[PDB]
């Protein structure tokens, strides 16, 4: 879990970009 910095960044990247997961 994460109390701090719990912002849905992936939610924006999902629509903003259409590519497979990467690390």
Strands of 1-23, DSSP E: none
Experimental method reported for this structure: NMR
**Residue 20 corresponds to which tokens in the numbers above?**
């497979």
Q: In terms of Cα–Cα distance, which of 12, 10, 11 is closest to 23?
A: 10
For 5: left if phi > 0, alpha if psi spans -120 to 50, otherwise beta; the answer is left
Rounded Cα–Cα distance for residues 3 and 1 (Å)? 7
């Amino acid at each position: 879990r994460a109390v701090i910095y719990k912002i849905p960044y992936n939610a924006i990247a999902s629509r903003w970009i259409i590519a497979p997961k990467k690390c």
